[model samples]
Target: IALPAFSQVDPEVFAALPAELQRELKAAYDQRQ
Candidate 1:
């Protein structure tokens, strides 16, 4: 129950996901930042 966004995952990983994930993912990372 604890997971959202992250960084440094390497574009290769994002490749598995959709373009929408990038925004959502970055949002999570920015929150921690």
Candidate 2:
């Protein structure tokens, strides 16, 4: 499964996540945008 646009653009959603996880997901999310 992949992240939705909300998960990528929403800052609060990423706050609870680990840094590395965000970095990893942010990569795909950013690219997916």
Candidate 3:
């Protein structure tokens, strides 16, 4: 799935997720760069 803009990412929302979700997010961001 496509990811959202970095500017659109909500740090608060991200902080609320589990560690695994956070890692998945990071992995997605890594592939996009």
Candidate 4:
């Protein structure tokens, strides 16, 4: 079995997630909100 790995995401799309989720997601993706 393998653990999930972080994947690269488009900053533009990632930045568009709902606010509640965006902050957390941005952190996971090493992005600034």
Candidate 5:
């Protein structure tokens, strides 16, 4: 199955997440425009 979109996860969760978790998550969502 495909993964959920970034918006599905709350920013609070993102903010409070462990350093590695936050880095991976941000990298996943980052497009590098």
Candidate 6:
């Protein structure tokens, strides 16, 4: 399954996530862009 885009998630929530999650999030984020 594909992950949700960064913009789909709250920045604050992303900020609060751990480094590994943030890394995956960033990958998804960059992919969206």
Q: How high is the CA lDDT of each candidate model?
A: 0.62, 0.68, 0.71, 0.52, 0.63, 0.67
List, residue by residue over 1-33, the lDDT tens digit for candidate 4. Answer: 021323545657656667777556546556532
Question: lDDT tens digits, residues 1-33, model 2?
Answer: 273644456778678788887688767667868
Off by over 4 Å in 3: 31-33
Output the number of the TM-score-best candidate. Answer: 3
lDDT of 4: 0.52
RMSD of each candidate? 3.9, 3.7, 2.6, 6.9, 3.8, 3.6
* Rank list by lDDT: 3, 2, 6, 5, 1, 4
The TM-score-based order of candidates, best leading, equals 3, 2, 5, 6, 1, 4
- Candidate closer to the true structure by TM-score (higher is better), 2 or 6: 2
Query: What local lDDT score does residue 3 receive in model 1, on the 0 to 100 scale?
Result: 52
Worst 10 residues of 5 by lDDT: 1-10
lDDT, candidate 5, equals 0.63
Point out where model 1 deviates above 4 Å.
1-10, 31-33
- Candidate 5 per-residue C-alpha lDDT over 1-33 given as tens digits, one digit per residue, 9 for 90 to 100: 124646666767667768787677667667552
After the best TM-score superposition of candidate 5, give how far the Cα of residue 1 lies from its true spot, in angstroms.
12
Q: How far is candidate 4 from the true structure (C-alpha RMSD, Å)?
A: 6.9
lDDT value, residue 7 of candidate 4: 58
Which digits, one per residue and each the tens of the lDDT, describe model 6 over residues 1-33?
164454556777877878887787667757878
Supply candidate 6's per-residue lDDT for 28: 70
Q: By lDDT, who's the top model here?
A: 3
